[PDB]
Amino acid sequence: GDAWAVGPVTIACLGALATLFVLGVFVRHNATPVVKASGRELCYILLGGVFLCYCMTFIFIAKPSTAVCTLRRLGLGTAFSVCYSALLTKTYRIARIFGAKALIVYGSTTGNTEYTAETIARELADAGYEVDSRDAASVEAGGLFEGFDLVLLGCSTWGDDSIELQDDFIPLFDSLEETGAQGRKVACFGCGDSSWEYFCGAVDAIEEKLKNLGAEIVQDGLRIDGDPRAARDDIVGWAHDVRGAIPRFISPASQVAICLALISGQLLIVVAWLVVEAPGTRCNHRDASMLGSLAYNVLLIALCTLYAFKTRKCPENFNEAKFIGFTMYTTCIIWLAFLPIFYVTSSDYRVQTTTMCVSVSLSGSVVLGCLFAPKLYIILFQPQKNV
Ligand SMILES: Cc1cc2nc3c(=O)[nH]c(=O)nc-3n(C[C@H](O)[C@H](O)[C@H](O)COP(=O)(O)O)c2cc1C
Numbered sequence: 304g305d306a307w308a309v310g311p312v313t314i315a316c317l318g319a320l321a322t323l324f325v326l327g328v329f330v331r332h333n334a335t336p337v338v339k340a341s342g343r344e345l346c347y348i349l350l351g352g353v354f355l356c357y358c359m360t361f362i363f364i365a366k367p368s369t370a371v372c373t374l375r376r377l378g379l380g381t382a383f384s385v386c387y388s389a390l391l392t393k394t395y396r397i398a399r400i401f402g403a404k405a406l407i408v409y410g411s412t413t414g415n416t417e418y419t420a421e422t423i424a425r426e427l428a429d430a431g432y433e434v435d436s437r438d439a440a441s442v443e444a445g446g447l448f449e450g451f452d453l454v455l456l457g458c459s460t461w462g463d464d465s466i467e468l469q470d471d472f473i474p475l476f477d478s479l480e481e482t483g484a485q486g487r488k489v490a491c492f493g494c495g496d497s498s499w500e501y502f503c504g505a506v507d508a509i510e511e512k513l514k515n516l517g518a519e520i521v522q523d524g525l526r527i528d529g530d531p532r533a534a535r536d537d538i539v540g541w542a543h544d545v546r547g548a549i550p551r552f553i554s555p556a557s558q559v560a561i562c563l564a565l566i567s568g569q570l571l572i573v574v575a576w577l578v579v580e581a582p583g584t585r586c587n588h589r590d591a592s593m594l595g596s597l598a599y600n601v602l603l604i605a606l607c608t609l610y611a612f613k614t615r616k617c618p619e620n621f622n623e624a625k626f627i628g629f630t631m632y633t634t635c636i637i638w639l640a641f642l643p644i645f646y647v648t649s650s651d652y653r654v655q656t657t658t659m660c661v662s663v664s665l666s667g668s669v670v671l672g673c674l675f676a677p678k679l680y681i682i683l684f685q686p687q688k689n690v
């Protein structure tokens with residue numbers, strides 16, 4: 304009769320208990336770095352989603368009613384949508400910040416502008432950028448700026464009659480049209496001497512050509528007078544203002560906005576089909592009412608796995624990106640394995656519903672077991688690491 308529901312209900316109960324435990328430990332330690340650095344708000348939205356996956360079991364084991372059918376269609380897509388929107392936004396946050404790529408191309412004869420470049424690069428990698436420093440002799444003009452979020456061009460001033468660019472930088476300057484400059488966020492730097500009429504004339508020449516090319520000049524170029532080693536405060540100070548180009552911060556309020564929008568998209572699909580195809584009684588629409596709902600979640604997961612794989616090497620918040628990666632790879636394995644299972648068990652409603660319950664629970668279990676279990680281990684057993 305209802306013995307088929309012992310297995311699913313036991314799982315859902317233990318899973319809801321485990322989710323309330325994980326929430327509790329997180330809230331108890333809400334101000335500690337492990338809980339704050341991870342993009343806190345998103346982690347709460349995720350546990351809510353996971354708790355809902357376990358709650359789905361009760362709604363599927365309960366007797367079909369117009370309300371039960373509404374909630375079955377409403378909840379199944381939404382519960383998963385809450386999980387994967389939280390996971391996508393977390394990955395987007397990592398990608399947007401540690402994603403950003405900077406390129407520094409310097410021109411130096413005595414290595415002063417090279418030192419200034421070496422200081423800026425260290426500061427930017429510390430800021431979160433994936434810096435790529437190169438000398439103007441090594442660089443080839445064609446497609447040199449492509450795929451870089453930020454580009455810094457360093458060069459010294461020469462000439463014994465007028466402004467002259469550093470020798471390695473002249474071939475780059477003359478063929479700057481074929482570099483990818485238009486629309487690119489740029490900044491210039493260089494070393495000169497105030498004993499010369501045109502102090503850092505090279506910086507001026509490069510800034511003006513970039514303006515003409517259609518580049519986004521982020522800041523007034525850095526002009527180092529004399530020894531750059533004595534201007535470290537000026538050079539680091541400038542690199543601090545430069546780094547605030549591709550934003551290195553996403554507000555918790557903005558994180559919940561993106562997440563909430565991605566949930567809203569599924570809710571629009573699931574409500575739109577409840578309006579056209581009214582719920583009723585077994586449940587009236589067990590056909591292709593959840594097809595759109597499924598496509599939306601298949602998109603979210605695929606997107607999330609692609610971003611998670613791209614962000615896998617990021618060490619921030621105790622290698623979180625690695626564990627977000629693992630939860631997504633396991634989700635793909637689950638989803639791709641249960642798809643033929645639902646097809647072959649379509650003849651038996653009890654087996655079909657039991658499988659649905661087990662798999663929805665399993666999907667929720669890999670989020671707890673892969674993302675939260677390593678976080679809970681540091682919180683509860685390694686407190687010295689959480690301070
Ligand atoms: C012949 C010569 C011409 C220079 N012309 C200028 C100039 O017009 N304006 C300027 O501000 N500095 C000028 N300088 C100063 C250099 O740019 C300065 O020595 C700089 O620190 C060298 O940096 P680098 O090692 O990166 O090439 C000139 C230096 C020399 C030796």
Ligand SMILES: C[C@@H]1c2nc(C(N)=O)cc(-c3ccc(F)cc3F)c2CCN1Cc1ccnn1C
Pocket residue numbers: 375376379380381383588589590591592593594596597598600601637638641645659662663666
């Ligand atoms: C198409 C729908 C569905 N929709 C979503 C979805 N909306 O994201 C997820 C799953 C699902 C995927 C992976 C897993 F492991 C467990 C799961 F439940 C399923 C499973 C079968 N189901 C049948 C159906 C049609 C109409 N009513 N129902 C109840």
